[PDB]
Paper text:
Equine rhinitis A virus (ERAV) is closely related to FMDV. The generalized picornavirus capsid is built from 60 copies of each of four structural proteins (VP1 to VP4), which are produced by cleavage of a single polyprotein by viral proteases (for a review, see reference 16). VP1 to VP3 each comprise an eight-stranded beta sandwich and form the three quasi-equivalent conformers required to build a capsid with a pseudo-T=3 surface lattice. Using cryo-electron microscopy (cryo-EM) and single particle image processing, we have determined the structure of native ERAV virions, together with the structure of a massively expanded, empty ERAV particle with large pores through the capsid layer.
Author numbering:
A (entry chain DP): 1 to 226
B (entry chain CP), F (entry chain C0): 12 to 20, 22 to 30, 32 to 40, 42 to 50, 52 to 60, 62 to 70, 72 to 80, 82 to 90, ...
C (entry chain FP), J (entry chain FQ), K (entry chain FR): 16 to 36
D (entry chain AP): 1 to 246
E (entry chain DQ): 58 to 226
G (entry chain AQ): 1 to 99
H (entry chain AQ): 198 to 246
I (entry chain AS): 100 to 197
């Protein structure tokens, strides 16, 4: 008559992720409909269909003067906790996890006078050297050149290239898996204005859209606040 | 051509516009009001000069549609005498060649220090993310169109629960003149009347 | 969501959860 | 690609050999990430006698960023059921309560309160009182012992009480016609209910509430709060991980 | 302390009956419909009331009812109240009347328990007025007329959520 | 049975009524307004106690729908902010067995001594003819329904041009008590808005 | 609506946009609301020796209004099964009965 | 009966499955009457603060 | 003896100082910040009367690598250092905090 | 009534409850 | 007789009880 069973040693323990609920103490509670639009099932979803300003210096944009040329314009170690990619949606989302596998996109919204032209260059430096510091060094890598004047912004896709199928959503001392490299933009042509008088500098917004192949795997509690 | 003439009721023509629907298209009477007016086309047709943009460090914005600025004239009079189900339609700025960009967005909005419901509060910098709430204006490309649907936790008392629009300075520079706007307007507009104010 | 055990429906979904419309 | 930005809408670039998916996004799924008992809150039980402080299950407050706090404030409106699991960490010599019954009684949005005495168990003398609203009845009670119990805990379902078609996290307006500093982001009962814990204990132990948010539906995205200071420009932030170097 | 108000030929302006439409407001205290409620926590229904006029068969009173949604602080004259949802009725041949105080509010369920002013407690007031001061064959024989205030649960009304009883207060 | 329940917007039940349409049924926007609101069902739903009938020699009447008594609460607010095309729907009296008749009529109305637009003016006796303008109340048969269409020399400024109802005492007698009404209401209700009152 | 009251039978009015149901009345269902172990009564056990006071399960008395009392006296006649659950709150040092 | 009797009580309980009710009756108030015209105010989940 | 066995997946942060605290009549006993429950599966078992002061569960393959290399000939980081030889960043199954 | 678990009929309805006619 | 549970035959009737002929 009575069934025969054996408790596992574990048995009367907790389990903070038991695939299966608990005892339904209140029942039959019918719930009212919801008519609110702008709903979501997936979080990656929102960061793909939405950019966020990267924080260069304390602002979300770099400058372009008619006295630049050689010098780098913008640089940062492509890892989801590198300075610039700190305040972004896409990067702040990440920290509920441990891993990402995606190429990112950036959009350069030039905001200088409508009498200003700046022309220009972006470059992705895979990890190896110790940060090229002149386009003449950087142009020998993957780069794109762009001419503001009629465009009114631009887009560059920093891909995913590495031996590991997933990388780290957390930066740390130089590993083959932390760093994916740098992202760089250069003054391929020092800015110009109707008068150097009226128009001193031009600027450019650096917006970060999640790439089209990007995804976060593995949820993880939050460490300490540092 | 950037012909941006938008009509409700008041024909706003304005070139400057480059028509963002926030989340959805507006909608069908409240689910929870077994109570009996579809405000007409007149009335639910306004235009408030917002402020005068000026050294304003990225972060400053022009804050709640539409209380305090509701008192300004035919629609206003109506919502005075319970609840209203209505989205909105609404920015314009006067500049030139030698000129600063704004992330103008429709927020579904915390903050407004219990002094909520229009003014100049800053925001906490991280503008890095205000681009996530359906929304920019760039003096190097234009001068203007946020069109939103009704929202609230199925209808509501617009004298207590506000779609609240903001305008943050992402990047102003040029000639020393000012750089002064916004054409607000209800849409699909209120349940049972209230006692004479006598 | 995280309930992939074939015992979750011991309590039918009325008692279990809620319902919408 | 040439972007004509400013009109919200992002902008992509797409390289060559685009990369194949795997993982399927899945681990970022809202309902999924939120269907797990978190350790949120922690309180002190009641003595059976006297008047209680009806605890309220409002998990829309945040602050200590234990990655569950931020996640709830990534949406505007939220609708999900609840499930709890009270535990009870003994605070002194775990052999001073030779029994400890704990009258965990859950209440639905709106249930009255005022709970003075009304029960009493008569037996040979002494007689120990129980809280009036604590007893069993309408709103689900659970009686578990705090002695020898290889897990001084319980746990159950709690379907969505609140009147609102959905729960608004951050409210811009007020909660009552008394536009008062407090009722701003309050709104009458944007929550899951209450709980009254009474046991012959109250001291000699705490608890660790917990929430399992099955059927979590989120609406109206919002920005996600950094949670970590800014570093030194140009560089990486370095948190000691599984990986790391050594 | 009674289940009815009066109607004299000296009224007019003044309110006749008023109460804060919430299932624990004075009048709706002794009613079946209200006493049932307290086994719970929530209701979602419009209520109905029936006005059984009991004055002499030589009496006529004519009259007005009004529902004041929550906002102001209780209109205190029909001239203030008539600008809201109201109904007028003439006893004489009717022999009673019915008024349906609907449900209008942003919340799908309200509170079966009243408390300090919330957007969810109060659904408003219910008011009845002397739109025409009472009349009799002789002011002598017939002084006052009366009227019963009976409460039928509305046709869309329902109680959800059982709850234990608090203390007795 | 003399069930006389009349609804617009406010459900007036009243036995007393014995439904007189004055001239015609109400109507199609103005012929002469190349100008763009069909006021809703709420709003265009009122009830004024008229006076208190008392030795009042045939001739006394209760005079202009609806100015002065317009200021009394949702429709009012609207006609404030040019012109309105609207008919009306409207009397009740509290009496007994031992009780005077009234010729209550809707006049299309001279008089009101440049103090026009509600009060107690007499009339010049010849009540002999007030029965010619579409219209009685008799305490020996009831207590109440004039329903009229829009009129004016194709629409008009209701703050200057008034359907004006009267009530003349053809024959009061009985018990010493008072004998105190009228439920006014717009119908088919206004062109272009006007400047904020600031 | 004109009511010709007095003959018992209530009287309704029905507004415009009547309101849709939800909840389905359900939570007011007699059998349902009463199918839950309530805490009613409380006694003192017997010593094995001597003569007992046979306790009687008559839950039709009411008084302390713990919303189960009223509910039973909302009907005239009642027919239902029963199920019990005795518990036993120790009254002193819960280590004096080793069995 | 138990070797106890003292050193403890009980808490009986009832589960009334298949409850059938007949012949309604009036439902007893359970709360005093308040002050006329107004609301009764019990501290709830909701409430104000 | 409650034991907060918390497992972590390849890459999860670390730095775990205090942040929790259970308040009750006085004393109050702290719990490790990252120890509490949440994202990465916790198990609370008592060390008293428990007829098996043990637990046990599943832990699917965390690590990024398509497969786990046992013996690596090369190095783990661009800091060709004595240690990172046969190391390789996270050739493992995770961690645990007790 | 409140018994929406698929184990309630472990004891068939004869032993479980009563019966009418 | 008093065994109306659907677990009585966990032990088949050979082990359970006896048998006649």
């Amino acid at each position: 008559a009575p069934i025969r069973v054996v408790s596992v040693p574990e048995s009367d323990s907790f389990m903070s992720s038991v695939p299966d609920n608990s005892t339904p103490l209140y029942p039959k509670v019918v719930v009212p409909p919801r008519q609110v639009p702008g709903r979501f099932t997936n979080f990656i979803d929102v960061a793909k269909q939405t950019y966020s300003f990267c924080s260069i210096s304390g602002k979300p944009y770099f400058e372009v003067t008619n006295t630049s040329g050689d010098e780098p314009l913008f640089q940062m170690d492509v890892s989801l906790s590198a300075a610039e990619l700190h305040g972004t949606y896409v990067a702040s989302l990440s920290s509920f996890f441990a891993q990402y596998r995606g190429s990112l996109n950036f959009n350069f919204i030039f905001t200088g006078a409508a009498a200003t032209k700046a022309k220009f260059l972006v470059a992705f430096v895979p990890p190896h050297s110790a940060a090229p510091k002149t386009r003449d060094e950087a142009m020998a890598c993957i780069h794109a050149v762009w001419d503001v004047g009629l465009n009114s912004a631009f887009s560059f896709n920093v891909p995913y290239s590495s031996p590991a199928d997933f990388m780290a959503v957390y930066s740390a001392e130089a590993t083959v898996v932390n760093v994916s490299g740098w992202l760089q933009v250069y003054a391929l042509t020092a800015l110009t204005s109707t008068d150097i008088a009226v128009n001193s500098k031009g600027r450019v917004l650096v917006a970060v859209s999640a790439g089209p192949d990007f995804s976060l795997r593995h949820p993880v509690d939050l460490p300490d606040k540092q | 051509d950037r012909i941006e003439t938008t009509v409700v009721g008041t024909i706003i023509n304005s070139q400057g516009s480059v028509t963002t629907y926030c989340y959805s298209k507006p909608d069908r009477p409240p689910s929870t009001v077994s109570d009996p007016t579809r405000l007409g086309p007149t009335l639910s047709r306004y235009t408030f000069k917002v402020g005068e943009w000026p050294s304003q460090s990225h972060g400053h914005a022009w804050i709640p549609l539409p209380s305090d600025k509701l008192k300004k004239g035919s629609f206003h009079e109506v919502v005075k005498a319970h609840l209203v189900k209505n989205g909105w339609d609404v920015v314009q700025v006067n500049a030139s060649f030698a000129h600063g960009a704004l992330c103008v967005a429709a927020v579904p909005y915390e903050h407004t220090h219990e002094k909520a419901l229009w003014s100049e509060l800053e925001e906490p910098a991280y503008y890095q993310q205000l681009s996530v709430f359906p929304h920019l204006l760039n003096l190097r490309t234009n001068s203007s169109h946020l069109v939103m649907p009704y929202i609230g936790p199925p209808t509501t008392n617009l004298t207590l629960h506000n779609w609240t629009i903001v305008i943050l300075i992402l990047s102003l520079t040029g000639p020393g003149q000012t750089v002064p706007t916004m054409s607000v307007a209800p849409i699909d507009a209120v349940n049972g009347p209230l006692p004479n104010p006598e | 969501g995280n309930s992939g055990s074939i015992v979750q429906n011991f309590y039918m979904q009325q008692y279990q959860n809620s319902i919408d419309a | 690609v040439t972007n004509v930005g400013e009109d919200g809408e992002p902008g992509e670039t797409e390289p060559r050999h685009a990369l194949s998916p795997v993982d399927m996004h899945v681990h970022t799924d809202v309902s999924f990430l939120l269907d797990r008992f978190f350790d949120v809150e922690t309180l002190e039980l009641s003595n059976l006698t006297g008047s209680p402080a009806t605890h309220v299950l409002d998990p829309f407050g945040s602050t200590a960023q234990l990655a569950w706090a931020r996640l709830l404030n990534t949406c505007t409106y939220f609708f999900s059921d609840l499930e709890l699991s009270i535990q009870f960490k003994f605070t002194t010599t775990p052999s001073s309560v030779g029994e400890g019954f704990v009258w965990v009684k859950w209440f639905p949005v709106g249930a009255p309160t005022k709970t003075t005495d009304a029960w009493q168990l008569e037996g040979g003398g002494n007689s120990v009182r129980i809280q009036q609203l604590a007893v069993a009845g309408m709103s689900p009670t659970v009686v578990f012992k705090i002695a020898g119990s290889r897990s001084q805990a319980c746990g159950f379902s709690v379907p969505y009480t609140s009147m609102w078609r959905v729960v608004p996290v951050f409210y811009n307006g007020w909660g009552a016609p008394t536009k008062e500093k407090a009722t701003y982001n309050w709104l009458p009962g944007a929550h899951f209910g209450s709980i009254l814990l009474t046991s012959d204990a109250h001291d000699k132990g705490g608890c660790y509430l917990r929430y399992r948010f099955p059927r979590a539906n989120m609406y109206c995205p919002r920005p996600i709060p950094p949670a970590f200071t800014r570093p030194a420009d140009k560089t990486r932030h370095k948190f000691p991980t599984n990986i790391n170097k050594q």
